[PDB]
Swiss-Prot record, chain B:
Coiled coil: none
Top-level division of the source organism's lineage: Bacteria
Domain notes: Contains an N-terminal signal reception (A) domain, followed by a hinge region (B domain), a transcription activation (C) domain and a C-terminal D domain. The A domain directly responds to external signals, the C domain contains the ATP-binding region that provides energy, and the D domain contains a helix-turn-helix DNA binding motif.
Quaternary structure and partners: Homodimer.
Annotated residues for binding of Zn(2+): C140, E163, C166, C174
Protein name, entry field: Phenol regulator MopR
Job of this protein: Involved in the regulation of the phenol degradation pathway. Activates phenol hydroxylase expression in the presence of phenol.
Gene behind the chain: mopR
Induction: Constitutively expressed at a low level from a sigma70-type promoter.
Whole sequence portion shown: 16 to 221 of 560
Residues annotated as binding phenol: H91, W119
Originating organism: Acinetobacter guillouiae (Acinetobacter genomosp. 11)
Amino acid sequence: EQNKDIQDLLDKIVFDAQHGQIWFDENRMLLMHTSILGFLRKDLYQMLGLERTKRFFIRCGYQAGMRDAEVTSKLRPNLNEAEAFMAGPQMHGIRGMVQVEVNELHLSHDLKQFYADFNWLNSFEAEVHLSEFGASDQPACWMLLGYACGYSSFVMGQTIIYQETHCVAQGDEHCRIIGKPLSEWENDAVSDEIIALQAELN
Amino acid sequence: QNKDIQDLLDKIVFDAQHGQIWFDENRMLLMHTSILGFLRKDLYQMLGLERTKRFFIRCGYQAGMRDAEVTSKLRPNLNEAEAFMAGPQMHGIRGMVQVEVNELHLSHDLKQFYADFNWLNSFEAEVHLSEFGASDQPACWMLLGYACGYSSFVMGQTIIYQETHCVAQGDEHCRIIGKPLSEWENRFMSPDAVSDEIIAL
Ligand SMILES: Oc1cccc(Cl)c1
Ligand SMILES: Oc1cccc(Cl)c1
Ligand SMILES: [Zn+2]
Ligand SMILES: [Zn+2]
């Protein structure tokens, strides 16, 4: 009943248990335990730095988001930009990663304007960071954030960068993101700009 | 309709508008294969083949061992084998590989185990080819770790598997044999040891 706005995404998702395949369009997916991701995060933290691991998860996110945008934009072009755009927050929820709540969204491909202010509820990534590292000094939703940048940059024609302003792992009540184009942030690896940015803010 | 996997499927709840997927009390993610692709490339160049192979067997091991935890108490009025089959069934459910049984016998009590399985549609084989191309050896490291983690848990002893054929080498399907440590021709600290056994093959 309650899937009017996501059904077109769901119709692309095909479970084939008997042949060991899950498909989103012509792309295989895997059902995985969030706790195995936390294990992976920690083992990567141990082998490489905090920085390399961070950067691993952002670049991964970034590819996943770009890939999903490739898929979700080939279809849904009878709609206006905002309804089209919303596939990305919908895919994040459909994949089990985070619930997106929109505070603000303004965008125009042709004006090269973008500004997003979303809340992130029940982020899996924050959960597993607390589980492996305990309370954090910095925002923890690295993979989710690269996905946001990747999805959003593909859909716009340009580098959109997000910042996680509040994070459940830091003890905030929910997580929160803000997305603008690169140069709107005063003052390839766009993962270095995301990482560099979070240091310049406080 | 048509399922001997329904007791497993029942436990999976998708809740997309709260951003959640569940298996029993445990939370899950539908992921891209790209993450594992990257991990595999990144580690190949940062760490070399041997360390990248072990890392993947280790991650598969931990997952297999976690499915075995969750599925353990679930089939008491079925025999040891029909219960064990959760592992192979879960692998298929999760979009990883399809398991066709050639042979399977096991006794916990007699400490006996032989498994000969075909692996069809291995996501891992596909990811190896698309990043490194043809292998010279079996490449389904994660899948193999899982087999070892799950089976070793259930049998309460070290079960090691050999991938005898692999789509990554140009064979038409992947194949594995699992037996106990002993039968081969030669908590946490024990997993590291088990993972190292199943890497020297
Ligand atoms: O969760 C998010 C946030 C912004 C954009 C997208 Cl595509 C997903
Ligand atoms: O795919 C497999 C193969 C053997 C055991 C398990 Cl639990 C899964
Ligand atoms: Zn967060
Ligand atoms: Zn293989």
